[PDB]
């Protein structure tokens, strides 16, 4: 029973995880270890959740009369520096400032294959408000000619400190 | 290999 | 499996409750059933989690030779307008405007026995910022006489537009 | 089932 | 429990 951790890349393209075991085998002859080298081949579906269970029959350690264990591995999401997997979506991080939040921003949001789309504000853009950038996400592993969304994630980042000149504007151009 | 779906 | 939803005021300083129940039961002919109500009294002591189970024994339906089920209550945690529960902490969402999160307010924080206590705020709230107000959460079970804290958990709330004259000025004071 | 309610 | 690793 063991990990087998992929990038979003790989889930995003697909790929071919070669992993190679040492178990014990029993000799031709009936009574005597042998140590023996296996790769076994994962081939990793587009779109694949975590949690998906990968089993080799038998593969395990070999010795006595009974019947060696199945190697399990289940798929695990590596952790990814630029978005959060979400089922089929990815959930990309935007941090701006205040003055960006109120006035205007353009995020330019990053994509899988490693393009980015200018996404253009106008409007007041709220501490963990959420945009939707359809199709940008992962391939659905049973269809995956469709893809989820990127979903654009505010993190609005305020001034460490307002002098008292500010302060006074501040109080005659927002709401009590 | 056995796979078992998510 | 039953629910018994409480109060935090209820887990603040514990609770008789009553609970009718209305059960199947066998006539003396041995033949036929009755329905009767009986009243179930469950004390419920200071700082009881979510999930404690009180069991009142052969309280089920009882439709022949057999012994009537357990009838099991599960504690659950009723939901306030106010507080949030997280184990013996309270946790208060105070909600203020983008110009207090900036330029300095007051919270009255109010308590489970019904005061208010001011905490002033200084310094830049920002977004989700947390601040303690120690032992002012709920007694700790196995050490009723001791209490948790009660946490500030801030939502700093954005104007819904800003006109042209007033972005033209928080451009000149709000950092990059 | 019981019926259970609170009084 | 035999051991598990990858390669190429």
């Given amino acids: ?176 | 290999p056995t796979i078992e779906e998510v």
Wanted: aromatic share 6%.
């Fill in chain 1, 1 to 176: 029973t063991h990990d087998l951790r992929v990038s979003l890349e790989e889930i995003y393209s697909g790929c071919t995880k070669k992993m190679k075991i040492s178990h014990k085998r029993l000799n031709p002859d009936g009574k005597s270890i042998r140590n023996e080298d296996k790769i076994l081949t994962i081939e990793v579906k587009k779109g694949w959740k975590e949690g998906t269970k990968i089993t080799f029959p038998k593969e395990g350690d070999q010795t006595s009369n009974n019947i060696p264990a199945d190697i399990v591995f289940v798929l695990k999401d590596k952790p990814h520096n630029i978005f959060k997997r979400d089922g089929s979506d990815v959930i990309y991080p935007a941090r701006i400032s205040l003055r960006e939040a109120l006035c205007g921003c353009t995020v330019n949001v990053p994509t899988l294959d490693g393009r980015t789309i200018p996404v253009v504000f106008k409007d007041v853009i709220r501490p963990g408000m959420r945009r939707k950038v359809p199709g940008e996400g992962l391939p659905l592993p049973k269809t995956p000619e469709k893809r989820g969304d990127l979903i654009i994630e505010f993190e609005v980042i305020f001034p460490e400190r307002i002098p008292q000149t500010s302060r006074t504007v501040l109080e005659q151009v927002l709401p009590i």
